[PDB]
Design a protein around this ligand. Structure first.
Ligand SMILES: Nc1ncnc2c1ncn2[C@@H]1O[C@H](COP(=O)(O)OP(=O)(O)O)[C@@H](O)[C@H]1O
Length: 280
């Protein structure tokens, strides 16, 4: 893992110019930059060292990512804690979050096959977290803003601040059984799947009661045989019946009330790849 002088971080971000701000997370602000004389594009996150929350997420992010390498996880390039700073340096994800291509956006809507391929990519990254590291990594904040898209639309999981060995995505079983299970990622990922299909927030607190939480509303509509009616209008008629059925049954299994009933990410990944094949 690389360490950057605080001067190199200023050079990368044209001295934290707000032209280069991409957004602000609860850790701090994120800047687009370039290092190595402009060959490598980067996203740079500045935390606040006097936030106890921030410092915990900072070391968690560095402890995790410095040992992981996977096509569908955002790579951490390096970091800077010089001058009592908290700076993280990642690969730039040129197409932003999955969420900003699903709704509340002026970006074009995504073809079904690319939506499916984005969800397979994320499922591969999550599968690697659960089976490819020394111990299972529980991401704990899987959501559509934490799936980033690079210049070639490769889906990548990000935001490892709450990782251990958001409303609407929270495993309801946590508030009841109180354990740490990777099945809590499966639950959140199932909500992500329903988001890709229906193109609406996982939690819309303005709706009728049954519809507030996508995780409950979409299973309910599928049982009633009306899931077709809350599908993204851009997707109407674009999904074959066998892909629709396989995709929806896979999402449904992920948001079961009990984590032990839920499939593994391996099983989920295989069923999405099966769905993609049934789409052709
Ligand atoms: N690694 C990254 N590469 C590219 N853009 C990123 C990266 N991390 C965050 N962003 C940008 O930030 C936004 C989504 O994440 P954001 O909420 O801003 O930061 P965080 O992920 O820390 O909460 C998008 O506009 C996205 O382009």
């Amino acid at each position: 893992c690389r360490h950057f002088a605080f001067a190199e971080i200023k050079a990368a971000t044209k001295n934290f110019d707000e032209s280069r701000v991409l957004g602000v997370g609860g850790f701090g602000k994120v800047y687009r930059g370039e290092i190595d004389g402009g060959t490598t594009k980067v996203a740079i996150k500045r935390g606040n060292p006097m936030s106890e929350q921030g410092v915990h997420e900072f070391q968690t992010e560095i402890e995790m990512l410095s040992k992981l390498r996977h096509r569908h996880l955002v790579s951490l390039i390096g970091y800077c804690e010089e001058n009592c700073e908290m700076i993280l340096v990642y690969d730039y994800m040129a197409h932003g979050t999955m969420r900003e291509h699903l709704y509340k956006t002026q970006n074009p809507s995504l073809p079904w096959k690319q939506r499916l391929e984005i969800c397979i990519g994320a499922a591969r990254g999550l599968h690697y977290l659960h089976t490819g590291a020394k111990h299972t990594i529980i991401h704990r904040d899987v959501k559509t803003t934490n799936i980033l898209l690079d210049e070639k639309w490769v889906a990548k999981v990000s935001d490892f601040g709450l990782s251990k060995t958001s409303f609407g995505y929270l495993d309801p079983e946590y508030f009841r059984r109180q354990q740490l299970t990777e099945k809590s990622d499966v639950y959140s990922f199932g909500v992500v799947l329903f988001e890709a299909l229906c193109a609406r927030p996982a939690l819309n607190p303005t709706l009728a009661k049954e519809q507030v939480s996508l995780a409950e509303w979409a299973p309910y509509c599928y049982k009633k045989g009306m899931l077709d009616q809350i599908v993204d209008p851009y997707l109407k008629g674009k999904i074959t019946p066998e892909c629709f059925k396989k995709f929806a049954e896979t999402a449904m299994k992920c948001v079961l009330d009990q984590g032990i009933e839920r499939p593994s990410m391996g099983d989920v990944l295989w069923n999405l790849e099966f769905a993609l094949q049934l789409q052709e």
